[PDB]
Amino acid sequence: PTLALTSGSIQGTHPEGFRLPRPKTWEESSESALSKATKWYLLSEIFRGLYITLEMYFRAPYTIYYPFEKGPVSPRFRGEHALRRYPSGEERCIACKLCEAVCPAQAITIEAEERIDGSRRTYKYDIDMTKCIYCGYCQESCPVDAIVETPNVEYATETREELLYNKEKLLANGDKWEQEIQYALDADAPYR
């Protein structure tokens, strides 16, 4: 038999002790008048508050001297995009257009056809680096690891035209950062 008889539930029932006791009056304060006034007139907690702040003055600060030092990075970090190659030198991308279809922001533009020697290669490949949200979906979807995000973050440009990376630019990044891409790929290969 449940408490539907009184339109009550287990959930509606408050725990024991839920009702507050009678609030104390001025005659039930444990502190004497002088103790309460010595703390009040001599700013007891403020002088403590100063003292705790002064403890920090004799501690080692946290600041690092960028650009002479860098904060930690991990192999999964997402930064600047780069198009990679095989060791033999052929471009890794087979113009499969997967990354273009995942890309949440539609930052990728791929135009492809059969190469001069028959290969399935891309002749136009742009990333609108001012439209990308640096999300890593293109990297996850590439079947041949052709498009990755290098750990670079220091590439701020004076003009916005310089942030429209075309296929020449991205392949030049893949050559520049190939060694660092291998650092991250070797470390985080099994986790993908």
């Binding site: 539907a4 008889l5 009184t6 009550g8 509606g12 009702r19 009678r22």
Partner: protein
């Protein structure tokens, strides 16, 4: 008749909830509103309505528990719907509902049926 009851006190010891002060006369006030609701229910709502049976189910039940439980803490744990100060507002709102429930005549035929294409989503009837 002119019986004026207090629903929400504006001063007194707190109850643990902000704005809900302790009620000076918990038990008598509940009994007055339970008796009124049982009385005022039959004045306006006919018997075939399930809602009338539902209120008389527990408004009777909450009226019998209050009488036999002088200790407030025994009232709360047996009704099981919060503090006694809350039960006053439950009882009060239970009373206001019948004045509107009778007016709406909400035991009758469905006033406005849905169109044949209303509760269909993407080509399936719900």
């Amino acid at each position: 008749q002119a019986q004026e009851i207090l629903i929400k006190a504006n001063k007194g010891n707190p109850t643990g909830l902000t704005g809900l002060f302790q009620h000076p006369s918990p038990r008598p006030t509940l009994i007055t509103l339970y008796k009124a609701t049982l009385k005022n229910l039959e004045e306006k709502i006919p018997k075939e309505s399930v809602y009338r049976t539902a209120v008389e189910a527990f408004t009777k039940e909450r009226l019998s528990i209050v009488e036999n439980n002088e200790i407030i803490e025994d009232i709360e744990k047996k009704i099981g719907s919060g503090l006694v100060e809350e039960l006053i507002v439950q009882a009060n709102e239970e009373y206001d509902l019948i004045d509107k429930m009778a007016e709406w005549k909400a035991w009758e035929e469905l006033e406005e049926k849905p169109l044949d294409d209303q509760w269909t989503y993407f080509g399936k009837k719900l």
